[PDB]
Design a protein around this ligand. Structure first.
Ligand SMILES: [Ca+2]
Length: 876
C-alpha cells in the first residue's frame, strides 16, 4: 500500500461541524451484510472534522485501504480533516486496549509509556496519513482488567495522554496533526482533562438527548444540574471557548432504550423527508447555542453521521421497524446545520462598523476575538497600550469586559459612556439562552448581574474631559492622576466613592483638582463629584478583644460593647451614628460629597441576626446576648455571622473580677478503650458536639464506656449532656465517673482485659433528671477513665449520651505530680524521723504545691517547680 502525501489545506476557522462516521457503514467494509450503499468519501464540504469510528472486533482491510488512498485525499481537497477515534482504553492497556495490549513491548514504565505514545500515533494516525487523533473518555471506553475498572490503568492513561501531546497537537513535534479529547464527563469527573488540556486542540462533549441539553434534574432541590452552561464553566478553566464543541446524535439503527435521544425529527408518515429538516430540533438548538461568557463556541458535531436524514421513531407510537433499514445519506442535516452557524449573529466579523480606528480593532481582535459574539461575551482583560489610537469608539459594544486598561493613549481627548464598556455601570445579562428548560425548575428565573469592568487609566497626556457620572463605581483605583496632565473638565458624581480624610480616592481626586485648577477651571460646572453613596461594609477585624469588669450587679450588652462598626472600601470605620453625621459634612473645597439622600440606616450594616457564643472558664457555653457580672469568672466571647455558623467573625476576652485560666476539654476525640456501649456511637460522646442528631445512643437502658484521654492532664471539672430537647425523661438519671490508679495495670501487654477486670476509683456519682450536669473535681490526673450511665427505665430503654467532657488544664505527668504529693501528705502525717520544724518545712512545700495546683491562674512551670521540690524531699 502506497499512501499519498497530505493535500495542502487551509487552517481551520470556525464555526466547525464534525461528524462520527461508523466504519461498518462504508460499502468497502461488509457490504453483503451491514451496508452496501454508503461511503465515508461522500461526506460534504460542510463537514470540517470527519471522525473514523471503528468496530474494533473486525478488520475491514479494504476500508482502511480505501480510506488512506482514496477517501482521505478526497476529503482533504474539500478541506475536511480525517480524525481517527480511539478509546480511552488504548492509552492504558489491558482488556481491549489495541496496541497497548502488548504489555511486554510497552511496559508501564516512564520509558515504556513514551514508547506506547509513539506507537499509538504511528499505528492510528501516521499509518494511513490521517489528520489527527481523537480519544473518547466515557464509560464504554474506561480502562478495565477482567471487566473491572483499573485505577492503575486510568492513572497510566494520564501519562500516555501527554506523551501523545508532545508528539502531536499544539504542544507536539508535529502540529499538523490534531489532538482531540471527546468526553461525556463534566470536568470534575474527567480524570484526564487537567494534565491533558494544554495538549489538545479541540474538546468535544457528548450531550445527547434531553439530559444533555437541560442537564440532570436534582429531584430533592427541584432544579437542574450539569447544564450546558454548567458543563461549559466546568471546562472553561482548562480550555478556551473556541475549543469547545457540543454533540448531538443521529438515530442509530436498532438502538435500544437509553440510546433513544430524539435529537433529530421524529417520524411522520405524511412527510417522508421530515428527517433532513432541521428547524426546531436539538441539533439546530445546539448549533445556535453560545455560552454566556468567555466567547463563542468552536462548533458542533454529530454521532452516526452516516445516519444523516433518518428520522427518529417514538416508542409508544408505532412498533414499525421501517426506520431501522439502512439507506444512503445525502447529508442534508449536516449541510443545513453548518450553514445555520455561519449565518449567525455570533460569528459575524468584527469590522470597520464596530471599531473604525484600526489600531483599536487590531487590539480587539487579538485580545477579545475576531467575531462579534465575543464583544457581547468576552470575560477578561483588554489592555490598550498602542499610542497610535485616534478614537475609542466601539468599546460601548463590549458588554462583559472584566478589565479595561488605557495606557499611554495620548491622542484621546474625552472619556464618557459612549467610549467605555456598557458594564462600566450596573447591567444585567441581555443574552437569552436558546435551549429547552426543565419544566418543573426553580433555577435561573432571573437575569444575571454582569460585574462592573475595572478601569485603569495612566499616561493619557491628552485627556481633557473625564466623565464617569452615574456609574456607581465603588472606587477610583487604577487612575494614575499624576500623569493626566491635560485634564480640564471632570465629573465623578452619583457613584459610591469615599473621597474623604486620606482615602486614596482623595489623593487621586485632589491630584486632578490641582491639574484642573492649574488650567484655571475650578468653576463648579467643571470638576463635580457630589451625590456619593458609599457602600457600607463589615469590618475585616474588630479592635476591642478585651474588657476588664468589676464584680457588681448589672446586665452588660456584649454586642454593643464588642461588635459594632461599618467600613468602606477606602477604609473608614464609623463605629457610632454620630461619626456618619460628621462624615456627611466632610467637604471638598467647600462642597458636601455624600448625598443628602443617604442616611445612617442605609449605610451602616446590621448585626441584627448575628449570634453569640460565650464560654466560661469551666468550658460552659450559653447563647445569651447580655451577661450578668454578679459573680466572678473569665469568659470567651465569639460572634458568628449568619453566613457561617462555625467560623468566628470576632473573638473577645472578658475578665470579671480576677482572671481565671480557661480550661480545656481533655476528652475530645478520646479513644474508646472498652466498655459495653456501641463503639461507633460512643466515639461521638467525645466529638466536641452537643446536639448530635447523628444518633448519640449507646445501649439498651444502661451503659458504660472506658476511654483514654489523648493527652493526660490535670482534671478539675466535668459536665455531661442529655439529648437536648430531643427527649423527655429518657434523660440520664444515674451517672458514675471513675478513674484509674496507674500502678494497677496488671499486664501492660493488653489494655482492655486488664481494665475491664480491675480496681478503679469513683470520682463522682450523680443522681437527678437535670439537663446539663456540671461539677468540679478534687484534682485527679488519670489517663484511663470509665463513665457509667442509667436512665432508670426498663430493659430496652435505649440510654443516650450526647457529649461528656473531662475538663481541666493540660499538665504533663499529672499523675506523678499527684502521687508524689500523695507520698508527701504520706510523710507529713507521721512524725517519725522528722523534726518538728523539719516536718513544718515539708508541710509548707506540700501546700505550696497544693496552692499552685489550685491557683485558678494555672502556672505549669511553677507547679513543676514546687513538684520537683517536694519530690526531692521525698527522695531523702
Ligand atoms: Ca458529642
Amino acid at each position: 500500500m502506497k499512501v499519498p502525501e497530505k493535500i495542502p489545506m487551509k487552517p481551520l476557522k470556525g464555526p466547525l461541524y464534525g461528524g462520527y462516521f461508523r466504519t461498518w457503514h462504508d460499502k468497502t467494509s461488509d457490504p453483503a451484510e451491514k451496508d452496501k450503499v454508503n461511503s465515508m468519501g461522500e461526506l460534504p464540504k460542510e463537514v470540517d472534522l470527519a471522525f473514523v469510528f471503528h468496530d474494533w472486533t473486525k478488520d475491514y482491510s479494504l476500508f482502511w485501504q480505501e480510506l488512506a488512498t482514496k477517501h482521505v485525499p478526497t476529503l482533504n481537497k474539500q478541506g475536511t480533516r480525517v480524525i481517527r477515534t480511539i478509546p480511552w482504553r488504548f492509552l492504558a492497556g489491558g482488556d481491549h486496549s489495541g496496541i497497548a495490549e502488548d504489555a511486554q513491548k510497552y511496559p508501564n514504565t516512564p520509558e515504556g509509556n513514551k514508547a506506547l505514545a509513539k506507537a499509538i500515533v504511528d499505528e492510528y494516525v501516521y499509518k494511513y496519513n490521517l489528520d489527527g487523533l481523537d480519544v473518547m473518555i466515557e464509560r464504554d471506553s474506561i480502562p478495565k482488567v477482567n471487566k473491572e475498572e483499573s485505577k492503575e490503568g486510568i492513572e497510566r492513561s494520564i501519562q500516555v495522554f501527554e506523551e501523545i501531546g508532545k508528539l502531536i497537537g499544539p504542544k507536539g513535534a508535529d502540529k499538523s496533526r490534531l489532538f482531540i479529547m471527546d468526553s461525556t464527563y463534566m470536568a470534575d469527573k474527567n480524570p484526564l482533562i487537567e494534565r491533558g488540556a494544554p495538549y489538545i486542540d479541540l474538546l468535544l462533549v457528548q450531550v445527547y438527548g434531553t439530559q444533555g441539553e437541560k442537564g440532570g434534574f436534582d429531584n430533592a432541590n427541584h432544579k437542574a444540574v450539569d447544564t450546558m452552561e454548567e458543563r461549559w464553566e466546568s471546562y472553561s478553566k482548562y480550555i478556551r471557548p473556541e475549543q469547545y464543541m457540543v454533540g448531538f446524535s443521529f438515530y442509530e439503527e436498532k438502538a435500544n432504550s437509553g440510546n433513544l435521544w430524539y435529537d433529530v425529527n421524529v417520524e411522520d408518515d405524511t412527510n417522508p423527508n421530515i428527517g433532513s429538516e432541521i428547524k426546531g430540533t436539538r441539533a439546530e438548538r445546539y448549533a445556535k447555542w453560545q455560552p454566556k461568557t468567555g466567547g463563542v463556541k468552536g462548533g458542533i458535531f454529530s454521532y452516526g453521521i452516516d445516519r444523516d436524514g433518518v428520522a427518529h421513531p417514538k416508542k409508544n407510537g408505532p412498533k414499525t421497524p421501517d426506520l431501522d433499514k439502512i439507506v444512503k445519506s445525502d447529508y442534508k442535516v449536516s449541510k443545513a446545520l453548518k450553514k445555520v452557524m455561519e449565518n449567525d449573529k455570533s460569528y459575524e466579523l468584527i469590522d470597520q462598523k464596530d471599531f473604525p480606528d484600526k489600531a483599536l480593532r487590531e487590539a480587539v481582535i487579538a485580545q477579545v476575538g475576531s467575531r462579534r459574539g465575543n464583544l457581547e461575551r468576552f470575560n477578561g482583560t483588554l489592555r490598550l497600550d498602542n499610542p497610535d489610537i485616534k478614537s475609542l469608539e466601539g468599546l460601548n459594544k463590549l458588554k462583559k469586559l472584566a478589565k479595561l486598561e488605557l495606557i499611554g493613549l495620548s491622542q484621546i481627548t474625552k472619556l464618557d459612556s459612549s467610549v467605555l464598556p456598557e458594564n462600566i455601570k450596573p447591567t444585567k445579562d441581555t443574552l437569552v439562552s436558546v435551549l429547552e428548560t426543565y419544566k418543573n425548575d426553580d433555577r435561573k428565573e432571573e437575569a444575571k448581574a454582569i460585574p462592573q469592568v475595572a478601569l485603569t487609566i495612566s499616561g493619557l497626556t491628552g485627556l481633557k474631559e473625564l466623565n464617569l457620572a452615574g456609574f456607581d463605581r465603588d472606587s477610583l483605583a487604577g487612575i494614575d492622576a499624576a500623569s493626566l496632565t491635560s485634564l480640564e473638565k471632570v465629573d465623578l458624581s452619583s457613584n459610591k466613592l469615599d473621597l474623604a480624610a486620606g482615602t486614596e480616592n482623595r489623593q487621586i481626586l485632589d491630584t486632578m483638582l490641582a491639574t484642573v485648577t492649574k488650567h484655571g477651571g475650578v468653576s463648579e460646572k467643571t470638576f463635580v463629584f457630589d451625590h456619593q453613596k458609599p457602600t457600607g461594609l463589615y469590618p475585616d477585624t474588630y479592635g476591642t478583644k478585651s474588657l476588664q469588669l468589676p464584680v457588681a450587679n448589672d446586665t452588660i450588652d456584649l454586642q454593643a460593647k464588642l461588635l459594632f462598626g461599618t467600613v468602606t472600601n477606602q477604609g473608614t470605620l464609623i463605629n457610632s451614628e454620630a461619626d456618619y453625621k460628621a462624615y456627611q459634612e466632610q467637604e471638598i473645597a467647600g462642597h458636601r460629597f455624600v448625598d443628602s439622600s443617604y442616611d445612617y440606616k442605609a449605610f451602616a450594616v446590621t448585626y441584627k441576626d448575628y449570634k453569640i457564643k460565650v464560654t466560661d472558664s469551666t468550658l460552659g457555653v450559653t447563647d445569651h446576648k447580655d451577661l450578668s457580672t454578679s459573680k466572678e469568672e473569665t469568659y470567651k466571647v465569639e460572634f458568628f455571622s449568619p453566613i457561617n455558623s462555625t467560623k468566628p467573625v470576632h473573638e473577645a476576652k472578658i475578665v470579671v473580677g480576677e482572671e481565671k485560666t480557661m480550661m480545656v476539654n481533655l476528652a475530645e476525640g478520646a479513644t474508646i478503650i472498652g466498655g459495653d456501649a456501641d463503639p461507633t456511637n460512643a466515639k461521638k460522646v467525645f466529638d466536641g458536639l452537643l446536639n448530635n442528631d447523628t444518633t448519640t445512643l449507646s445501649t439498651s437502658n444502661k451503659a458504660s464506656i472506658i476511654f483514654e484521654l489523648k493527652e493526660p492532664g490535670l482534671v478539675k471539672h466535668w459536665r455531661f449532656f442529655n439529648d437536648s430537647k430531643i427527649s423527655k425523661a429518657d434523660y440520664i438519671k444515674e451517672a458514675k465517673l471513675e478513674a484509674f490508679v496507674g500502678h494497677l495495670e496488671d499486664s501492660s501487654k493488653v489494655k482492655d482485659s486488664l481494665e475491664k477486670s480491675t480496681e478503679w476509683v469513683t470520682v463522682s456519682d450523680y443522681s437527678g433528671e437535670a439537663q446539663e450536669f456540671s461539677q468540679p473535681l478534687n484534682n485527679i490526673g488519670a489517663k484511663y477513665w470509665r463513665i457509667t450511665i442509667d436512665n432508670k427505665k426498663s430493659q430496652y430503654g435505649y440510654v443516650s449520651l450526647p457529649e461528656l467532657q473531662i475538663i481541666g488544664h493540660r499538665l504533663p505527668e499529672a499523675a506523678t505530680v499527684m502521687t508524689t504529693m500523695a507520698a508527701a501528705e504520706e510523710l507529713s502525717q507521721q512524725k517519725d524521723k522528722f523534726s518538728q520544724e523539719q516536718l513544718k518545712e515539708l508541710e509548707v512545700k506540700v501546700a505550696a504545691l497544693k496552692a499552685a495546683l489550685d491557683n485558678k491562674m494555672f502556672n505549669a512551670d511553677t507547679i513543676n517547680a514546687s513538684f520537683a521540690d517536694v519530690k526531692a524531699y521525698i527522695d531523702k
